[PDB]
Design a protein around this ligand. Structure first.
Ligand SMILES: [Mg+2]
Lengths: 1316, 613
DNA sequence: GTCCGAAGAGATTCAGAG
DNA sequence: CTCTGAATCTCTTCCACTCCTACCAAGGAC
RNA sequence: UGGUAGGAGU
């Protein structure tokens, strides 16, 4: 079965692999994140409710007052999205919060509160998100690109051989909280652990432990094993477990029970270790020199006197052991230090640090954190308590805690937000184990370590930042002594929250300005993943490794689509199927593999879990049962790919196109061209200005329909039915009964947006693609947006292309276009400009917009009306006056030079309180009549639909064939019905419609007031006049035109039609490319694309010949069936027998100018299939035709490739690039401003150009460029006066920039003098 | 606001913005001569406005400046006639956005065209590094008379034939002209008109035009060849030669002095460059400019007539590729099986796998190239015969027009092993070429290196720019001030031998440099070269015959002149066949010549003798 | 009507060593 | 215990031309 | 206007 929109034009689809999972919603990330942020979400987790609940409980310093919130709600936006866009106001919704205030009795908080206050409060405006995923902030659509950053947690960086030149690795550990201070642990070259808080100066690591009220003995116990030694009568026998010493040489002779098992000076292997373990002789005797090496662990005090024989971390010695012998202590503690296994890292740090008590560590911490201030015990205690264990100053999010526990190999997933002493100790122990060789470092680029932060999370963080200061202000206000003085409304201020949200949404590194030249550009901009922004890398700081593509990018981030240039790799687009995890990481679907069978259920795997399993490749033969016939199916294990047995595999790729982005997947034959050219082609599709008429690609990937419908450009029917009324402005759909709601059933009206300026100054219009009475269902496209054709993304046009050199006009990348391309206007693009005029309130009287302009000709005023505004539809040109704008004393807004287009409409905004000029009256009365007409038309159409649905109720025995006709026109809902209770229902519905039209007229009055009310304006201007010019561009030499496989070029010459090469039948080729562009930059996709395009157009021409002359439907139908059944093993399987024999005619009509072909990115048509398709038509299999020269008339040798290629016109126009200047304005430094074409700037003669000028030995040219054309004002005027008199002299003079520099240096107390 | 890039010193004092300047997209114009350049009518009208005003006042159409300004704004008919007079012989300076070479800015004689794009000469674009893909170029107008004379004498494109970095020519047929010349100068075993005997090149052109003879048919043409045996005199030599029709046709544009041996060969890019250099050496500059224009026109015309095209049937996959792949896979499986038993360690297994795959890739590439180069087999006069193929991709590769051996290897053979981002080599190479499909995994492996190279270039640009700036400033002051120091100290020039073949021939290092001390003949008590003579091609050739390894040469570091170097120590100008002129800014030239190739430079027993001696 | 990363070079210090 | 070496910190610089699109900034009090 | 970023082209 096929949809009705599919019936009219169904694209032939190659591709053997049957897709299991369809492409998800393209913009799911933005919508899902914002819906999570702002919605009624109880229990906390993440959302606005969680942010409200985290902070709002108020503790007052003896204020006795508690303030807490009950609930929050969102008010209806004052204006609709279109109204906000037109007015230039933010599309936001008020945030209403029900706050409660309770104060207890004095010296009595135990009982009920003496006063309980509850009052809804207004907190601020939250900019709501449009349906498509865009934000309207000041009448301009903006998008918030999701940010990618290091996930909160703990990482262990190698820092391998960067310093010390010795090749040693300085292992370090880092803790990154979501909000707090960084904590670092570092290894010095001397094997000493150092701690750095917030990237301050180094500090001994054991200072933190001492600051954690940890005894030195406790530290030794935690970070070191204890070797028990005892004082005995017989040689003072040592205790030594055999398992402790493994794989080390023994200096002493090892005798157990008298018999020697391991001799002195010999290492111990496994057999002696096992022998000793079996013996289990823990006691041993060593020479008195052996004990001297060890270091004591615990404090030992003489029982006789109480003095300290040896404190902790003190090396043992002969006198020390003698004193212990006099002490008679039966237990001697020595730290188990083994150079190969362990390390005395902690012991040396305790040896180095000067602190010996908690207070010493605390004052050292205070000194390091806040230098200069004197050390205070209580202040230091508070500072350390608030650094890492206070909820407000420090917090690890749930994702951060999960990552921390997972890195520390703990089973618990969720824990406290703040750190703990055990956590720090475990981090340091893990770092020590890393140093000893037990464990591995973590790579930063791993996609398990990076996180996705969308608009919802960043908006929530900004809201929290705004809320904390309001909370502080409320706490400060509550400190004042008051009781029931005021409501909990004047206490809070909406300004901090409003500013904190508006600044983020309007002025941020990630609140990017949307580009709307294509539906594809709109889709891609919402799918971007930018590593920059707040809390992220910068272009300069980003290293070489970050820009590289990691092995874990497979299926998560596109390896192809990324901007070439400064930020290469820092910005990249999310892949097709990749959807963010609930924690924040990136996931990709995978087909589960049972025992030898590939199943249907799909598991989304994150980055970490993907490593363990063995995942098969997408391109492997399944044969509709599983059991890959080859027993060496290629699979990619952890970070590597190798062959595996068919049973070893555990997962499968869902589809071939799950690696590339949406933008890069539009390219056909993506697997046949180099990655560089694919990157260029993916980046160039986003800059294709929409053409005058959309033309579907003859050969495409096949997902263009999905990206067209999933954007907001096309109008898609939400409820199916029949098209009651269609028109170039709007479409009205009569909903089918089953989908039609019972209560107040009506018909939905689709209002199309006609020519409107986009962000890139291109036209946006909706074209109705449905006819009158044509049935539609839910989800079919009703109107085509910009650059879409029947619901398919039509970026450019497909034209005949020949690959041959032609008299050097296509030399390196130039393109020669036939004049036939210009003649039929198939590359013409509309451009809408916006010129604004403001009636500023300057001194000497306000500036007025009036018709009479002093000292100008009447011809200028002829175009203007009597009110000083330009007539709608006037063919203005550069310099023509658009508004009066007379200033007391002239300065009238006029069309800038080089602009020539009709003025489509004018919008006038007038300050509330001042008079309205006659054109303002005309505009407001026309808009009021238009609003009245719209309301009356919708009311009449809805009335007709409702009264027709009432007839259906009246049909059931309540009305006859003549009863309704004889009934008066006011009471069709009042008729004798059999049921006698559904009659009461009809009366209720009639009353509901009566009140509904009262509501409609009330909303009409509200709309009239909105038009009548003085719209808000910035202070200092009475009225704002906006004039929209609409210039129609045309192709010409110098324009940039590009294909899809990164083969950009510039138009060189518009060849006449007769000069172009022509084939045997006489059809000229539209464009000739250059063959030399293919072998060097390997993009064979275009050659295969042009062969397939020739095949498609051959099929189209065959059915056109079958249609130009009358042919029976059977012949045409069987030919179309043969064309659709061409593939050897394709999955399309269209049968024309199920068609209605009239829809076949419509399909043939839609196919007569081409046969669309779908070739997925990595499962496209093979060469043999293309040759077979060419043989289906009457075309050569080789794909090359013998062309005849247009002018000479002699046929070319070496048959030349000819075919149809999809070519785009890029936004890099030529009339917007060409510029020139002879004399204009100058700056304060008297150089020309070079605002470019904006203020008639002069091209800058840069520093690297004077080097070339003086390398030639050209002194006079350099002098004139430095002085006479730039800065010497006297030189400038003298040179200008000399030129017009026929003289070409030159007065050098002195540049003004040098004098400015002289004054600048003199301003610093440094004497500059041009001494003679 | 004084220091840094944004300060006065860098932004405003050395980077003053200039009036009388414009910017527009560039496009190729094959109609132009070497010294000319296209210029839009509107751009020319705006740039030359004061000259137009002056001409209007002088002629008398406009009495006052306001009247002339209004008339120009009206762009009346008379204004265009006045404009044509103004820009008749007024050079304009054209430069690209990055100006690395001295040749980054050049002067052209402009011609008025319609449109909004500047038309640039195809041969010039090699020095500018222009690509005609949205490239932009700014124009400047020299106002003063001294500036006009200066641009004409120094900056004009016809003057810049040899780059200052090295004596090699800077203009050379590059992409389509070289392909057309290679197609024209080629031989086919059997072709229409073979075996004919022709009167001269005009007859060959007449035969090819009328279609009676093919462009590649081997014939015997009488050729009038001029050799300047006498000093300043040419003697004609006429003889029958065994050359194709295409070579005979091309002989018409060749100047008088050059011999016929240059045209008779296949004429690849190196051959065309050598022919242009020979013309420059023999007949000077003006014949070289005329010859370059004629070569470009002829190459474009015959490349267009050839109709060379690329198609999916041009890239042929060798028939033995599957067998080689099967053998390599069998060997790697055998090595893996040996590793499974533990007989061979993992590291040596990986090294052996790498070696096996490299050998298989070499075998596949060699088989494909052997099948490609001689693919065409021609049957002539009965028995069959072999010849160099006419495959379009192979014709592009051989002529040097575009592509290389590696590009063809990737198009019709194994792509080879691809390195990981860390630098290690992936065990399994990319078996599939670009003519056939690449599965997802192989595309990912390719994308690794592609992204690494793109980032490398993106940062190479900035690093090279910084190095060039430092070099230019450290050597700004050096200017050839004096003429001779009379010093005797010098450095010793010997060829560099790094344990093998000659890395630099001796004649290349010492060419164009004067000697500090008289060179001693291999015959004892005899001197080959005087003390202070400048070594040139002839002196080096005489030095070649005696072949003395060590020659003392005056150098810049040994120059005893203060605040500058003498003309003798520097030697040849490397851009003209002359000792360097006094006042030349050699420091900036040296710094720019060093810094220009910086973008190309990436960031990241027993002793047995080969030959008897 | 008016007013309050990473890379390098370098300077400073600092720990070893005689 | 002066005094050559090594640790630290500290400053400076990281291409060059455009196309543009926004954000931004001194009052009521005397 | 002017200072900032933001994206893009070579
Ligand atoms: Mg370019």
């Amino acid at each position: 079965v096929y949809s009705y929109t599919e019936k009219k034009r169904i694209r032939k689809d190659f591709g053997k692999r049957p897709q299991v999972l369809d492409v998800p919603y393209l913009l799911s990330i933005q919508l899902d994140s914002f819906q999570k942020f702002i919605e009624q979400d109880p229990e906390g987790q993440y959302g606005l409710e969680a942010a409200f609940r985290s902070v709002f409980p108020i503790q007052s310093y003896s204020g006795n007052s508690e303030l807490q919130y009950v609930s929050y709600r969102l008010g209806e936006p004052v204006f609709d999205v279109q109204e906000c866009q037109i007015r230039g106001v933010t599309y936001s919704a008020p945030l209403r919060v029900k706050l409660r205030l309770v104060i207890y009795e004095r010296e009595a908080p135990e009982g009920t509160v003496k006063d309980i206050k509850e009052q809804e409060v207004y907190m601020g405006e939250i900019p709501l998100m449009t349906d498509n995923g865009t934000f309207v902030i000041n009448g301009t659509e903006r998008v918030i690109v999701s940010q990618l950053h290091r996930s909160p947690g703990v990482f262990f960086d190698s820092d391998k051989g960067k310093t010390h030149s010795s090749g040693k690795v300085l292992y370090n550990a880092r803790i990154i909280p979501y909000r707090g201070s960084w904590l670092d642990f570092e290894f010095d070259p001397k094997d000493n652990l150092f701690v750095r808080i917030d990237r301050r100066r180094k500090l001994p690591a054991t200072i933190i432990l001492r600051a954690l009220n940890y005894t030195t003995e406790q530290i030794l116990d935690l970070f070191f094993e204890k070797v028990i030694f005892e004082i005995r009568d017989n040689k003072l026998q040592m205790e030594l477990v055999p398992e402790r010493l493994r794989g080390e040489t023994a200096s002493f002779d090892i005798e157990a029970n008298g018999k020697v098992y391991v001799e002195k000076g010999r290492r111990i292997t496994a057999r002696h270790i096992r022998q000793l373990e079996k013996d289990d002789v823990k006691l041993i005797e060593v020479p008195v020199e052996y004990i001297a090496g060890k270091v004591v662990a615990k404090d030992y005090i003489d029982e006789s006197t109480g003095e300290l024989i040896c404190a902790a971390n003190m090396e043992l010695s002969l006198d020390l052991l003698a004193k212990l012998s006099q002490s008679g202590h039966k237990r001697i503690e020595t730290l188990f230090t083994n150079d190969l296994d362990h390390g005395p890292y902690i012991s040396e740090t305790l040896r180095v640090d000067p602190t010996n008590d908690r207070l010493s560590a605390l004052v050292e911490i205070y000194r390091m954190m806040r230098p200069g201030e004197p050390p205070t015990r209580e202040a230091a205690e508070s500072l350390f308590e608030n650094l890492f264990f206070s909820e407000d100053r420090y917090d690890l999010s749930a994702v951060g805690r999960m990552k921390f526990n997972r890195s520390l190999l703990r089973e618990e997933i969720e824990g406290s937000g703040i750190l703990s002493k055990d956590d720090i100790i475990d981090v340091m122990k893990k770092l020590i184990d890393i140093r000893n060789g037990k464990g591995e470092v973590d790579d930063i680029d791993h996609l398990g370590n990076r996180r996705i932060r969308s608009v919802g999370e960043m908006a929530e963080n900004q809201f929290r930042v705004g809320l904390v200061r309001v909370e502080r202000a409320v706490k400060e206000r509550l400190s004042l002594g008051d009781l029931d003085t005021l409501m909990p409304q004047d206490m809070i201020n909406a300004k901090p929250i409003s500013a904190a949200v508006k600044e983020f949404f309007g002025s941020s590194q990630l609140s990017q300005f949307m580009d709307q030249n294509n539906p594809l550009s709109e889709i891609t901009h919402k799918r971007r993943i930018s590593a920059l922004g707040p809390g992220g890398l910068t272009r300069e700081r980003a290293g070489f490794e970050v820009r590289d593509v990691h092995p874990t990018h497979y299926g998560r981030v596109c390896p192809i689509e990324t901007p070439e240039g400064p930020n290469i790799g820092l910005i990249n687009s999310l892949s097709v199927y990749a959807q963010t995890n609930e924690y924040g990481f990136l996931e990709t679907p995978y087909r589960k593999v049972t025992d030898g069978v590939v199943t249907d259920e799909i598991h989304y795997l994150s980055a970490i879990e993907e490593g363990n399993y063995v995942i098969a490749q997408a391109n492997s033969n399944l044969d509709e049962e599983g059991h890959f016939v080859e027993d060496l199916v290629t699979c990619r294990s952890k970070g590597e790919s190798s062959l595996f047995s068919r049973d070893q595999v555990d997962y499968m790729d869902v589809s071939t196109q799950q690696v590339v982005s949406v933008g890069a997947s539009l390219i056909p034959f993506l697997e046949h061209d180099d990655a560089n050219r694919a990157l260029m082609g993916a980046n160039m599709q986003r800059q294709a200005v929409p053409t005058l008429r959309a033309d579907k690609p003859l050969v495409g990937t096949g997902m263009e329909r999905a990206v067209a419908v999933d954007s907001g450009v096309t109008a898609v029917a939400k409820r199916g039915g029949v098209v009651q009324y269609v028109d170039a402005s709007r479409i009205v759909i009569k909903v089918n009964e089953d989908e039609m709601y019972p209560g107040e059933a009506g018909i939905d009206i689709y209002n199309l947006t006609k020519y409107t300026r986009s962000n890139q100054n291109t036209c946006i219009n909706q074209m109705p693609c449905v006819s009158l009475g044509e049935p539609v269902e839910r989800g079919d496209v009703l109107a085509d947006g910009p650059s879409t054709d029947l619901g398919e993304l039509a970026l450019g046009q497909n034209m005949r292309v020949a690959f041959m050199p032609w008299n050097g006009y296509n030399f390196e990348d130039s393109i020669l276009v036939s004049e036939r391309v210009v003649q039929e206007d198939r590359f013409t693009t509309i451009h809408i400009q916006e010129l604004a005029c403001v009636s500023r309130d300057t001194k000497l009287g306000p500036e007025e917009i009036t018709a009479d302009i002093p000292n100008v000709g009447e011809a200028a005023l002829s175009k203007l009306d009597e009110s000083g505004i330009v007539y709608i539809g006037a063919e203005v040109t550069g310099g023509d006056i658009l508004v009066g704008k007379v200033t007391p004393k002239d300065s009238s807004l006029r069309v800038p030079n080089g602009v020539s287009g009709t003025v489509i409409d004018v919008q006038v905004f007038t300050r509330d309180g001042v008079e309205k000029d006659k054109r303002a009256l005309e505009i407001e009365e026309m808009q009021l009549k238009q609003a009245k007409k719209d309301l009356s038309e919708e009311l009449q159409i809805l009335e007709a639909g409702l009264f027709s649905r009432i007839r259906a109720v009246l049909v059931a025995g309540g009305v006859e064939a003549e009863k309704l006709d004889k009934l008066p026109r006011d009471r069709w809902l009042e008729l004798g019905l059999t049921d006698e209770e559904k009659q009461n229902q009809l009366e209720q519905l009639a009353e509901q419609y009566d009140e509904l039209k009262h509501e409609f007229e009330k909303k009409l009055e509200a709309k009239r007031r909105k038009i009548t009310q003085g719209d808000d304006l910035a202070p200092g201007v009475l009225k704002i006049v906006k004039v929209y010019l609409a210039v129609k561009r045309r192709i010409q030499p110098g324009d940039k035109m590009a294909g899809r496989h990164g083969n950009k070029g510039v138009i060189s010459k518009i060849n006449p039609i007769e000069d172009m090469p022509y084939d045997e039948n006489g059809t000229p080729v539209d464009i000739v490319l250059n063959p030399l562009g293919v072998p060097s930059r390997m993009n064979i996709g275009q050659i295969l694309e042009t062969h397939l395009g020739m095949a498609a157009k051959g099929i189209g021409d065959k059915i056109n010949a079958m249609l130009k002359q009358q042919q029976e439907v059977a012949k045409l139908r069987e030919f179309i069936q043969r064309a659709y059944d061409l593939g050897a093993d394709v999955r399309q399987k269209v049968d024309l027998s199920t068609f209605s024999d009239e829809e076949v005619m419509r399909l043939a009509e839609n196919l007569r100018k081409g046969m669309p072909i779908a070739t997925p990115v990595f499962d496209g048509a093979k060469e043999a299939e293309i040759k077979e398709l060419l043989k289906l038509g009457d075309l050569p299999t080789s794909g090359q035709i013998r062309l005849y020269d247009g002018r000479t008339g002699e046929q070319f040798e070496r048959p030349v490739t000819v075919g149809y290629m999809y070519m785009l016109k890029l936004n890099h126009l030529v009339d917007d690039k060409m510029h020139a200047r002879s004399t204009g304005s100058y700056s304060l430094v008297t150089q020309q401003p070079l605002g470019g074409k904006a203020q008639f700037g002069g091209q800058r003669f840069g520093e690297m150009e004077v080097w070339a000028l003086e390398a030639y030995g050209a002194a006079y040219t350099l002098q004139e460029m430095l002085t006479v054309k730039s800065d010497d004002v006297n030189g400038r005027t003298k040179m200008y006066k000399n030129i017009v008199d026929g003289n070409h002299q030159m007065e050098p003079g002195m540049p003004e920039s040098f004098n400015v520099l002289l004054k600048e240096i003199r301003s610093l107390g440094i004497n500059i003098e041009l001494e003679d | 606001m004084i220091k840094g890039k944004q300060g006065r010193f860098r932004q405003n004092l050395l980077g003053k913005r200039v009036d009388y300047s414009g910017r527009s997209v560039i496009t190729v114009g094959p109609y132009l001569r070497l010294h000319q350049c296209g210029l839009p009518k509107k751009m020319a009208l705006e740039l030359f406005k004061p000259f137009i005003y002056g001409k209007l006042e002088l002629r008398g159409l406009a009495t006052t400046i306001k009247a002339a300004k209004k008339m120009v704004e009206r762009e009346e008919a008379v204004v265009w006639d006045i404009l044509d007079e103004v820009i008749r012989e007024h050079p304009v300076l054209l430069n690209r956005a990055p100006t690395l070479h001295r040749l980054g800015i050049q002067a052209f004689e402009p011609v008025l065209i319609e449109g909004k794009a500047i038309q640039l000469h195809p041969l010039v674009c090699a020095a500018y590094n222009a690509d005609f893909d949205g490239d932009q170029m700014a124009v400047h107008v020299p106002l003063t008379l001294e500036a006009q004379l200066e641009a004409r004498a120094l900056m004009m494109s016809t003057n810049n034939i040899l780059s200052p970095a090295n004596g090699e020519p800077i203009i050379v047929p590059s992409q389509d002209v070289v392909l057309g010349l290679y197609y024209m100068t080629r031989d086919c075993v059997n072709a229409k008109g073979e075996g004919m005997v022709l009167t001269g090149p005009k007859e060959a052109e007449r035969l090819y035009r009328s279609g009676l003879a093919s462009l590649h048919a081997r014939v015997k043409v009488r050729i009038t060849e001029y050799e300047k045996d006498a000093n300043g005199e040419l003697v004609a030599k006429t003889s029958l030669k065994d050359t194709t029709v295409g070579r005979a046709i091309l002989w018409m544009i060749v100047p008088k002095g050059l011999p016929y041996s240059i045209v008779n060969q296949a004429l690849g890019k190196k051959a065309i460059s050598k022919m242009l250099n020979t013309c420059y050496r023999i007949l000077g500059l003006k014949p070289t400019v005329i010859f370059a224009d004629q070569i470009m026109y002829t190459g474009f015309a015959y490349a267009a007539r050839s109709g060379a095209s690329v198609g999916i049937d041009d890239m042929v996959i060798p028939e033995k590729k599957h067998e080689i792949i099967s053998e390599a896979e069998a060997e790697v499986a055998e090595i893996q099986e040996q590793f499974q038993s533990g007989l061979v360690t993992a590291g040596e297994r990986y090294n052996k796998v790498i070696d096996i795959w490299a050998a298989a890739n070499d075998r596949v590439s060699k088989a494909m190239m052997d099948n490609l180069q001689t693919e065409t087999v021609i049957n002539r006069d009965g028995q069959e015969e072999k010849q160099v193929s006419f495959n379009s991709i192979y014709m592009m590769a051989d002529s040097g027009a575009r592509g290389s051996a590696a590009q063809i290897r990737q198009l019709a053979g194994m792509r080879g092993l691809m390195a990981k981002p860390d630098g290690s080599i992936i065990e399994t190479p990319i078996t599939a070429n670009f003519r056939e499909g690449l599965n997802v995994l192989q595309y990912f492996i390719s994308t690794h290196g592609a992204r690494k190279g793109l980032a490398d270039t993106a940062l190479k640009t900035a690093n090279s720019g910084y190095l060039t700036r430092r070099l230019v400033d450290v050597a700004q002051d050096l200017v050839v001030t004096e003429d001779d120091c009379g010093t005797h100290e010098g450095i010793m020039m010997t060829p560099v031998i790094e344990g093998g073949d000659v890395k630099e021939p001796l004649r290349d290092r010492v060419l164009g440099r004067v000697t500090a001390e008289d060179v001693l003949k291999p015959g004892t008590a005899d001197i080959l070269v005087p003390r202070n003579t400048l070594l040139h091609e002839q002196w080096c050739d005489l030095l070649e015959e005696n072949s003395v390894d060590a020659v003392k040469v005056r150098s810049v570091v040994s120059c005893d002149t203060d605040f500058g170097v003498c003309a003798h120590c520097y030697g040849r100008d490397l851009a003209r066949g002359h000792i360097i002129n006094k006042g030349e800014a050699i420091g900036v030239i040296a710094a720019q010549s060093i810094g220009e190739p910086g973008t190309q430079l990436t960031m990241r027993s027993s002793i047995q003798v080969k030959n008897k001696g």
